[PDB]
Amino acid sequence: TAQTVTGAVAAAQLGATLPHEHVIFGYPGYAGDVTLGPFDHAAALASCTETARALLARGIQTVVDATPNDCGRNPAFLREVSEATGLQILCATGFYYEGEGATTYFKFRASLGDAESEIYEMMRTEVTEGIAGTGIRAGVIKLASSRDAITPYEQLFFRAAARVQRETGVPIITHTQEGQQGPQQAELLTSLGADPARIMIGHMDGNTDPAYHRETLRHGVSIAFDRIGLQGMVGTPTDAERLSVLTTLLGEGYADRLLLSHDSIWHWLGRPPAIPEAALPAVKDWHPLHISDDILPDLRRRGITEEQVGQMTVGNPARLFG
């Protein structure tokens, strides 16, 4: 059974799922801008609950919140949103990648002792017991790596997660930076004994060469085109490019291993971002209703079957997280 912020749910009750989104999110440092960028709890709850209701209207029953521990993760808030709407939400345990995470703390611990073991204890505790003493458990482990390599800092997390995976069976979802390291992540995790059927390599839509995806898929892991809607936003390709690669893969029979999400942020922590003019088109379709309203219908018109769409949105999530 999957562990959600309101308790365990049977694989069968997960339904259509968005495997990677962010109810709330803040880049590391946002907490230091608390005076002019405070969290308006009432406003966030209202906004997030309306977004949640809109997903329910689309038949989406579950969302996997992939927010790292150092990026504004708030299991208690996720629980309020879930209790107020009925939307099921899984939260994560893990730290962001070296280039953008709050890395000083664990680099410090690592200099004094066994950081891998401490990260392992944190992950195991949050998965099996609860987070911050709330009784709310993490339903997934979030791992993330840099573009040019899975750094030594990042590896600490990959190794701790592999062990927690082996001991608990918990799912693992990841972040790949700028369309690279997908194969390395799959290889590393599987060589450490992690169950390939419970691993989702993320941001794979970030690379538009299908050879890169097939190689990653050779490891038996699943891969997610989880930033659908974010187009040409520094690196990120266009949705047209994503769909081209996605239909090529579906035609090669990979439906059992493909997942789809937006990586949307429902409410920002810190001061809300003001998107400049030149960037409006890049974020226009970057919201959690995009796949349901635009992408799936477009796949169907391209020849993709209802069975294939259901495999990606309901089948795979049930197997991976349930």
Ligand X SMILES: C[As](C)(=O)[O-]
Binding-site positions for Zn(2+) read 20, 22, 142, 175, 203, 263
Please identify, among the stretches 118-126, 146-154, 211-219, 291-299, the one whose residues bind Mg ion according to the rule CB under 5 A.
291-299
Q: 273 or 303, CB closer to Mg ion? A: 303
Per-residue interface string for the shown chain with Mg ion, residues 208-247, x marking contact by CB under 5 A: ----------------------------------------
**Per CB under 5 A, 166 contacts Mg ion:** yes
Site for ligand X in 167-206 (CB under 6 A): 175
- Give 210's contacts (C-beta < 8 A, 6+ positions apart): 245, 248, 249
CA distances from residue 187 to 139, 181, 218, 256, 260 in whole angstroms, order as listed: 23, 10, 9, 19, 22
Q: How far is the CB of 293 from Mg ion (least distance, A)?
A: 8
Give the bridge partners for 225, in sequence order: 260
- Residue 71 binds which entry of Co ion, ligand X, Mg ion, none, with Cβ cut-offs from 5 to 8 Å by kind? ligand X
Is 124 within 8 Å of 164 (Cβ atoms)? Answer: yes
Q: In this chain, which of 13, 282, 298, 322 binds Mg ion, going by CB under 5 A?
A: 298
Size of the site for Co ion (CB under 5 A): 3
Q: Give the residue among 184, 94, 193 at the shortest CA–CA distance from 146.
A: 184
Q: How far is the CB of 305 from ligand X (least distance, A)?
A: 30
**Per CB under 5 A, 175 contacts Co ion:** yes
**Per CB under 6 A, 309 contacts ligand X:** no
Q: How far is the CB of 22 from Mg ion (least distance, A)?
A: 18
Paired tokens of 106: 């664990």
User: What is the tally of helices (H) and strands (E) in the chain?
Assistant: 13, 12
Write out the H or E segment, with its range, that includes residue 82.
helix 75-85
**Per CB under 5 A, 195 contacts Mg ion:** yes
State whether residue 63 is helix, strand or coil: strand
Q: 176 or 308, CB closer to Co ion? A: 176
Q: What is the CA angle 94-27-322, rounded to 5?
A: 35
Please identify, among the stretches 54-62, 63-71, 162-170, 292-300, the one whose residues bind Co ion according to the rule CB under 5 A.
63-71
* 224/107 Cα distance (integer angstroms): 29
Q: In this chain, which of 98, 116, 126, 263 binds ligand X, going by CB under 6 A?
A: 263
Write out the H or E segment, with its range, that includes residue 259.
strand 258-260
**Per CB under 6 A, 267 contacts ligand X:** no
Q: DSSP letters along 5-54, please? A: TTEEE-GGG--EEEEEEEEEE--TTGGGGTTTS---HHHHHHHHHHHHHH
Q: 71 or 246, CB closer to ligand X? A: 71
Q: How far is the CB of 54 from ligand X (least distance, A)?
A: 20
* Contacting residues toward ligand X, per CB under 6 A: 68, 71, 96, 175, 263
* Contacting residues toward Co ion, per CB under 5 A: 66, 175, 263
